[PDB]
Design a protein around this ligand. Structure first.
Ligand SMILES: Nc1ncnc2c1ncn2[C@@H]1O[C@H](COP(=O)(O)OP(=O)(O)OP(O)(O)=S)[C@@H](O)[C@H]1O
Ligand SMILES: Nc1ncnc2c1ncn2[C@@H]1O[C@H](COP(=O)(O)OP(=O)(O)OP(O)(O)=S)[C@@H](O)[C@H]1O
Ligand SMILES: Nc1ncnc2c1ncn2[C@@H]1O[C@H](COP(=O)(O)OP(=O)(O)OP(O)(O)=S)[C@@H](O)[C@H]1O
Ligand SMILES: Nc1ncnc2c1ncn2[C@@H]1O[C@H](COP(=O)(O)OP(=O)(O)O)[C@@H](O)[C@H]1O
Ligand SMILES: [Mg+2]
Ligand SMILES: [Mg+2]
Ligand SMILES: [Mg+2]
Lengths: 336, 329, 318, 257, 348
């Protein structure tokens, strides 16, 4: 129990258990909490960037609705490991939806408000085929009195159009250093991490639109600090060194090579840079940040460099070779 | 325990009869005259998602036979198997025998028949017309290209136009009658423009803004509550961002974009659509501007559909807008 | 509770003379029926021109009262695998029946394009051997899907689309038999939206007649929804991008048409666009296919169709 | 509450085996009179209706009328994993929940308690068998089974014609035809072999062969099948049990001619 | 030799001391080690460092491995077989073996090892988590990646996922986020030269000076394994005597790609394109990844000095385009021939 929750990473150690610990999306948790007193829970469709709280808030809503006793008998969960095909979604999901709700015990009925319906959660619905989602339509429509569906996804476009109308949409906003710093402060205080004044802001800015990455980053930084045993604080450089963030000096060197240089010099420096392990996505992001936030260039350069960086990012997002794409980006940005 | 008030607003307000189906007047009238005269040919409903097709056909099945429609009426939705081995045995046996309860024509409702294999439709092509004086087929669909031309020709085509403003307004008034609630006129206009014809999104965001009132009996749903429930960008800051992108320089435009998209937690996918809808009204005095303005924005939207980055795509939108608004000068 | 038959079925011709299709082939079938020496024939054409009804009236006139035991019709609903074509078709081929002198047993294999190649292979000799008693008659929609030997043994009989004159003649016959008030404009609109389809024309006639009583242009253009491919063909040939975009917005998008259907219809229209050249057609098809691929991944908003139209205009203008 | 203790174990197994592969989802209504049930086929052509009174049960206790919906596949799975020598008890709580099937041996203590989660079937309880039938007849199950499974090899349709003291089963197919004509006669030495017929009007109507082959599977329960026929009415095939009866309502196939 | 001289602990890693200190930091509290993802250049020493951390957290008996065979079945009758490198403390999988059936292998084996636990004697069952090593995670299919990402948090007290891969880009954002990211930089020349010096003083090879090891390190581009292998091949061919004048032994495919680049830059015609297609067929047919062929061809083309700036720029642009197209197709020759035709049209 407590020793079990102690023996797991900070991601699972501080996973919110109720609707009050999820301090990121006040627009959706309000409806989910108002649903408690009422009984008209519509078919939900949580969608948003990775690591935001969807899978962690649906479980909290379930725990608060039914309780630890009825939860294991009143919900079905199809996330990714089960075989979610047309035959399975036609047989098993339909059988569980067209099924009588279980009898709530006196303890559960007295403590938690038990609504007269079960819950089928299809986690990461963007991995299902089109025929499975098409079959889900009337299955979720006709048995709406004893079963409510909750879909979760990172891309709403992948879900077919009919399911985008049946379910009520809930967009989970990204987590920057503005509305998510409180949870990180609370975790750092609960773990006695000797953080600096503004290192949490840098941690949250590194994990653009994500919190779990920031949590594991803080955990790794605290572990590396405790290993040395010096007890000193952790600097922004200390956390950005292990976060994949490329140092600023070598970035300035890259920009200096771009500002003037032939094809051979840039190719040699790109090879030497790729000799070390640097994620091309982070390098592209930092180059974009440095070039856009600057004011020393002209608009006729800014528009072209923005388009080129966008094209390079779209190329890198398809899982291609980092070296070739980075070299092409640097050559094309030097051509201007 | 179980009652009518526990159902979500998507299904709680399902039209029971044909009289509670607004918007598609020119089809409901023809269907009522069909069932009144006594003749009812093979129907084929074709419309966008959430228009009233299934509700209309269920109300028709209730009106024809009685309050017990799912007794002598067969219904093959996408939840049942509809292979060729099914259209061979089940549908043919249902269409080759009489009813069990009364003496009338039988009804077969093939809901969402666009999800049928070509062989199944080719097999149905002859059984749909071999037994005509006893059974009638009703094919509901959203994509009119999945159906073979033969099956598409045998059925009378009825298109379900998207709900106009008046129909959604009447439905909103009827919902506000049964549920103690008040809704602002500008909020009504924003909800209509956000509906995009979808009658389900209307009821969904309505339930949301009702839940986000903390006392859904006195306070009225203003436009801010509706814009917050779905997270859609208000026209105000949308036009402000568009003006700052068109007029100001790069640094301050990027700053105001990052400030607007972080004040309420907006999404770039919605900002792109809003800017496109606002900017489609401009009178560009050249054709080369709109070409790039659409091409680059569509490419950026397709790239967002894969979730590559979040700020590079925003600066890409800014650059596309600025570079497209340059051939004018 | 009695349900009247539809106008498509209640007025289905039961006599070979009432067919208003291709005059030459119908006259050939009429002379064959009056003579009786009917050879194997394949009937193929556009969907809804009267092939099945033609062959059925032919069989009814050739066998008369023996139609109950002389004809064995196998449709797509019935099984048409190798087992049935080897057992039941063969047992019906050798079935000794005493028919009038100049008559023969007939086998109506409707929808021949859906049968497996092995079935036709097994059917070749079963048809060729017993030509003295069995005369097969295929009726499909795509003659290319039939294997070569089966198609070559029989005498082919192509069918062309119904001209507007034949459709208007049959429409006038139906109105005269049903006592309906009509105007010329309504009938012209019905023929124009019928795209040469007898069944679709009669269905739209019955719909508008029961819906408004008076067959006028307003009623049909109100509840018939003038065909899709023509609007798309008009959209792709606009002069400036703004006109084509306005057409797409008002006629296609606002009227509730899915983006995938618009893309598929635009592809099919460009496939048969004889006005423009070949290279421009290939480039337009490539761009339409790129837009189709973008649509199939889920993103199907109006912006994608707008960018597709912009690319087509950039291609056609330069 | 609901407690129904049978006298034996294989009774319910043989009862369910009548319509095992004919219907999928049933709904038993338990009242003070006994267990009733009616279920429609997948194609909505025939309906199985079973009534078992309190005579076949060793013990019966039901306070208020309860409805219990369930699929037949899982029910047959539960009945198969029970030994045919135990005693079966159906148990239901106050509110309709997972029904408890309990097998208890009579010699050694073996408590086999299986649960079956109920389905939520719409309670569209149907009221048939109040319609005056034109013709009624009764004949041994073996003869009916033989005739039907002999005629099923020639076609897929079977025409039953009840004329003046004549019953005629006619099969017409592709390879040939067949006609079995029987006449009413009663024997004193063997009262079970007699075929009884009471008609008011001659009735000719067709049925399918698959549904008849699925119906005649219930011949393992009784030995005297009753057949009630009427124009514009579902044919009634009744098997008489020692406590209740199992009746199939088949829909006749109309003729285009 | 490659396999002989390899560190077997954390106190024996002799390059990238910062990464070794970070690994020692991650090896202090084993019961709180999250999932790991190693990324960096090929042949950097990722698997050896992984198995060294695994030995540091577990006992020293983790190196004794054994190969087992597991047979799975898809929806159809097609039975597939996989090899598993198991040890009393972990198991290593290479899911890239199956073409498009990785989603079955992951969701079956990971679930099977996650549900139950490990029992072995070396106080009968109480043990810590079990470790699963995944080699070439960058080649995982997207659906298999989703299954693997979901089978991470559900059962976290039993399975710790330590994946390794070069060119981390084909990894979906959820997997990139829910695990720690450790970079493995290639060792510098001053350290790979020391590695070679230790190898040559241990294996007793006759070398004249230290310039040979420097040339080997410069030729290997930073790859430690390829440098060691080339050193061993040079020692074998030179008959136990390394001299200052020795031809660097490039692998056969490198020489084939160099001859291909020569043929490209010399004759720009379709007749040469036919022989180019023949060479690409002969190369792909002998188990060579098409992306590696493309990378080597493009870099050797940029190495050519007789081409000006615009030619090399358009070449690198076409290479980026066809590399994007290569990761979205199956017939690789269809893209390689197109890239060759494009570079031929570009050169003249
Ligand atoms: N809104 C939040 N409030 C508090 N903690 C959060 C929140 N979102 C994420 N976390 C933390 O990050 C962990 C991961 O959150 P999850 O909800 O499981 O991730 P996710 O939303 O499922 O992203 P996916 O699975 O890639 S779509 C949680 O266990 C928390 O420790
Ligand atoms: N014309 C309408 N008038 C009133 N309410 C409507 C109308 N159309 C839809 N609705 C509402 O939307 C709900 C669902 O409508 P349906 O007719 O089931 O959607 P649909 O036509 O089946 O489209 P699909 O199946 O999702 S593609 C109904 O229960 C109503 O609450
Ligand atoms: N030439 C015609 N004259 C009169 N009615 C016709 C004619 N052609 C078709 N019809 C009508 O169309 C219906 C019968 O058409 P079919 O024979 O089913 O068409 P088809 O040639 O079989 O093409 P398919 O099978 O639908 S792809 C009846 O309602 C006829 O009245
Ligand atoms: N610290 C080190 N000291 C000596 N040799 C090393 C060291 N690190 C790596 N190596 C060499 O690397 C080789 C193994 O490379 P490997 O780990 O298989 O590459 P990859 O990480 O691409 O799988 C071994 O032969 C070993 O000699
Ligand atoms: Mg999740
Ligand atoms: Mg529907
Ligand atoms: Mg036909």
């Amino acid at each position: 129990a407590e020793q079990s929750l102690a023996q797991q990473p900070w991601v699972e150690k501080y996973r919110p258990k109720n609707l009050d610990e999820v301090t990121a999306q006040d627009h959706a948790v309000t409806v989910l909490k108002k649903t408690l007193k009422s009984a008209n829970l519509p078919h939900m469709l949580f969608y948003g960037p990775p690591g935001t709280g969807k899978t962690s808030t649906i479980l909290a809503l379930t725990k608060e609705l039914y309780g630890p006793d009825l939860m294991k008998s009143r919900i079905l969960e199809l996330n990714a490991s089960d075989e979610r095909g047309i035959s399975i979604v036609r047989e098993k999901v339909k059988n569980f939806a067209r099924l009588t709700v279980s009898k709530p015990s006196k303890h559960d009925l007295e403590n938690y408000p038990c609504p007269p319906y079960k819950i089928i959660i299809l986690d990461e619905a963007d991995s299902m085929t089109a025929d499975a989602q098409s079959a889900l339509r009337r299955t979720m429509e006709t048995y709406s009195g004893v079963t409510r569906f909750c879909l979760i996804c990172n891309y709403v476009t992948r879900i077919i159009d009919p399911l985008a109308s049946r379910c009520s949409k809930f967009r989970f906003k990204a987590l920057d250093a503005s509305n998510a710093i409180d949870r990180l402060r609370f975790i750092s205080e609960q773990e006695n991490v000797k953080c600096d004044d503004g290192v949490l802001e840098r941690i949250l800015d590194i994990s653009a639109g994500d919190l779990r990455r920031g949590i594991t980053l803080l955990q790794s930084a605290s572990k590396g600090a405790q290993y040395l045993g010096d007890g000193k604080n952790i600097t922004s450089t200390q956390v950005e060194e292990l976060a994949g963030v490329v140092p600023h000096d070598i970035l300035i060197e890259i920009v200096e090579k771009v500002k003037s240089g032939d094809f051979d010099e840039i190719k040699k420096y790109v090879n030497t840079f790729m000799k070390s392990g640097w994620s091309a996505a982070s390098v592209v992001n930092q180059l974009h940040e440095y070039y856009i936030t600057n004011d020393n260039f002209d608009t006729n350069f800014k528009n072209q460099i923005s388009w080129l960086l966008f094209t390079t990012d779209s190329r890198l997002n398809n899982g291609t070779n980092e070296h070739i794409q980075l070299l092409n980006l640097l050559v094309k940005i030097s051509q201007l | 325990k179980r009652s009518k008030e526990n159902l979500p607003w998507v299904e709680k307000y399902r039209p029971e009869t044909l009289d509670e189906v607004y918007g598609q007047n020119e089809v409901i009238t023809t269907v009522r005259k069909f069932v009144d005269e006594g003749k009812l040919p093979h129907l084929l409903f074709y419309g966008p998602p959430g228009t009233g097709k299934t509700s209309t056909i269920v109300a028709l099945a209730r009106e024809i036979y009685g309050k017990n429609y799912s007794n002598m009426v067969l219904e093959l939705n996408a939840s049942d198997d509809r292979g060729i081995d099914v259209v061979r045995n089940q549908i043919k046996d249902f269409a080759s025998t009489r009813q069990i309860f009364s003496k009338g024509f039988k009804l077969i409702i093939l809901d969402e028949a666009d999800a049928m294999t070509n062989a199944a439709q080719n097999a149905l092509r002859r059984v749909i017309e071999r037994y005509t004086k006893n059974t009638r087929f009703c094919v509901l669909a959203n994509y009119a290209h999945k159906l073979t031309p033969a099956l598409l020709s045998r059925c009378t085509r009825f298109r379900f136009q998207p709900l106009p403003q008046e129909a959604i307004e009447r439905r909103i008034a009827n919902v506000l009658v049964h549920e103690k609630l008040k809704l602002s006129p500008n909020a009504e206009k924003a909800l209509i423009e956000l509906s995009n014809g979808d009658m389900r999104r209307v009821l969904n965001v309505l339930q949301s803004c009702k839940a986000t009132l903390d006392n859904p009996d006195e306070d009225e749903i203003s436009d801010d509550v509706i814009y917050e429930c779905c997270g859609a960008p208000r026209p105000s800051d949308l036009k402000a961002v568009l003006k700052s992108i068109l007029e100001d320089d790069w640094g301050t435009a990027h700053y105001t974009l990052n400030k607007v998209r972080s004040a309420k937690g907006l999404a770039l996918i919605d900002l792109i659509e809003g800017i496109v809808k606002i900017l489609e009204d401009y009178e560009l005095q050249n054709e080369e501007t709109r070409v790039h303005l659409l091409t680059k924005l569509a490419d950026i939207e397709y790239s967002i559909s894969k979730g590559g980055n979040d700020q590079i795509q925003g600066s890409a939108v800014i650059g596309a807008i600025k570079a497209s608004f340059e051939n004018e000068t | 509770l009695s349900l009247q038959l539809p106008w498509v079925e209640k007025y289905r011709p039961q006599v070979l003379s009432d067919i208003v299709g291709n005059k030459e082939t119908i006259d050939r079938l009429q002379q064959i029926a009056k003579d009786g020496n009917m050879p194997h024939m394949i009937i193929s054409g556009m969907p809804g021109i009267g092939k099945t009804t033609s062959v059925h009236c032919l069989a009814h006139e050739l066998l008369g009262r023996s139609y109950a035991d002389g004809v064995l019709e196998l449709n797509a609903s019935d099984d048409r695998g190798i087992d049935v074509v080897r057992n039941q078709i063969k047992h019906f081929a050798q079935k000794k029946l005493h028919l009038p002198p100049g008559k023969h047993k007939i086998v109506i294999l409707d929808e021949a394009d859906s049968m497996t190649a092995g079935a036709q292979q097994a059917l070749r000799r079963t048809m060729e051997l017993y030509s003295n008693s069995t005369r097969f008659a295929f009726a499909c929609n795509q003659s290319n899907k039939i294997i070569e030997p089966l198609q070559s043994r029989c005498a082919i009989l192509r069918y062309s689309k119904l001209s507007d004159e034949d459709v208007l003649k049959r429409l006038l016959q139906i109105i005269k038999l049903e006592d309906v008030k009509y105007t010329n404009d309504g009938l012209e609109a019905i023929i124009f939206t019928a795209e040469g389809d007898m069944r679709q024309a009669i269905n739209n006639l019955q719909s508008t007649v029961a819906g408004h009583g008076l067959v006028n242009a307003d009623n049909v253009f109100k509840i018939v929804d003038s065909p899709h491919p023509l609007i798309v063909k008009k959209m792709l040939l606009a002069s400036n991008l703004e006109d084509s975009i306005q057409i797409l917005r008002t006629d296609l998008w606002k009227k509730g048409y899915s983006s995938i259907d618009i893309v598929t219809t635009s592809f099919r229209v460009t496939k048969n666009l004889a006005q423009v050249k070949e290279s421009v057609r290939l480039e337009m098809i490539k761009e339409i296919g790129l837009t189709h691929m973008r649509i199939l991944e889920g993103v199907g908003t109006y912006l994608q169709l707008a960018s597709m139209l912009a690319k087509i205009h950039k291609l056609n203008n330069k | 509450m609901l407690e129904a203790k049978f006298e034996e174990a294989s009774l319910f197994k043989r009862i369910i085996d009548g319509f095992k592969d004919c219907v999928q989802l049933v709904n038993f209504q338990c009242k003070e009179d006994g267990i009733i049930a009616q279920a429609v086929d997948d194609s909505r052509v025939l309906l199985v209706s079973l009534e078992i009174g309190v005579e076949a049960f060793q013990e019966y206790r039901c306070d208020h009328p309860v409805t219990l919906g369930m699929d037949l596949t899982s029910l047959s799975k539960i009945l198969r994993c029970g030994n045919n020598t135990d005693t079966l008890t159906l148990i239901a709580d106050n509110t309709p929940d997972s029904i408890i099937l309990l097998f208890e041996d009579t010699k050694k203590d073996r408590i086999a308690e299986y649960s079956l989660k109920l389905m939520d079937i719409d309670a569209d309880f149907l009221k048939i068998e109040e319609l005056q039938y034109d013709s009624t007849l009764s004949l041994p199950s073996s003869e009916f089974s033989k005739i039907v499974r002999d005629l099923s090899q020639l076609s897929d349709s079977i025409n039953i014609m009840i004329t003046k003291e004549t019953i005629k089963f006619v099969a017409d197919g592709d390879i040939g035809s067949g006609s079995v004509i029987i006449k009413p006669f009663v024997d004193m030495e063997h009262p079970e072999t007699s075929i009884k017929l009471e008609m008011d009007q001659p009735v000719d109507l067709t049925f399918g062969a698959k549904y008849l082959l699925d119906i005649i599977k219930g011949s393992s329960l009784s030995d005297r099948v009753g057949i009630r026929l009427s124009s514009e009415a579902p044919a009634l095939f009744q098997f008489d049990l020692k406590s209740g009866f199992l009746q199939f309502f088949l829909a006749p196939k109309f003729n285009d001619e | 030799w490659v396999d002989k001289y390899r560190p077997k602990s954390l106190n024996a890693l002799s390059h990238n001391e910062e990464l070794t200190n970070f690994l020692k930091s991650l090896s202090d509290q084993p019961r709180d080690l999250p999932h790991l993802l190693l990324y960096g250049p090929n042949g950097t020493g990722k698997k050896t460092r992984c198995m060294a951390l695994l030995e540091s957290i577990f006992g020293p008996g983790v190196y004794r491995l054994k190969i087992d065979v597991r047979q799975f079945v898809t929806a159809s009758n097609r039975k597939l077989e996989l090899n598993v490198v198991s040890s009393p403390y972990h198991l290593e999988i290479t899911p890239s073996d199956m073409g498009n059936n990785d989603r079955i292998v992951i969701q079956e084996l990971l679930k099977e090892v996650a549900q139950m636990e490990q029992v072995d004697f070396q106080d009968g069952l109480a043990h810590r988590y079990k470790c699963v090593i995944i080699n070439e995670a960058n080649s995982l299919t997207k659906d298999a990646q989703a299954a693997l990402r979901r089978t991470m948090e559900k059962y976290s007290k039993n399975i710790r996922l330590i994946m390794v891969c070069d060119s981390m880009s084909p990894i979906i954002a959820p997997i990139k986020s829910r695990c720690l990211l450790i970079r493995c930089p290639a060792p510098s020349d001053s350290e790979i030269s020391t590695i070679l010096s230790d190898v040559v003083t241990n294996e007793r090879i006759q070398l004249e000076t230290k310039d040979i090891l420097k040339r080997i390190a410069q030729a290997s581009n930073g790859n430690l394994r390829v440098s060691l292998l080339m050193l061993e091949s040079m020692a074998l061919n030179n008959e136990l005597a390394l001299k200052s004048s020795s031809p660097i032994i490039k692998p056969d495919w490198i020489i084939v790609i160099h001859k291909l680049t020569r043929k490209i830059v010399k004759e720009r015609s379709v007749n040469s394109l036919i022989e180019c297609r023949a060479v690409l067929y002969d190369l792909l047919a002998h188990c060579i990844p098409a992306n590696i062929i493309l990378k080597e061809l493009t870099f050797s083309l940029l190495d050519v000095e007789t081409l000006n700036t615009t030619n090399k720029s358009s070449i690198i642009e076409y290479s980026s385009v066809f590399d994007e197209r290569l990761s979205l197709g199956n017939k690789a020759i269809f893209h390689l021939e197109g890239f060759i035709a494009k570079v031929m049209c570009c050169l003249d």
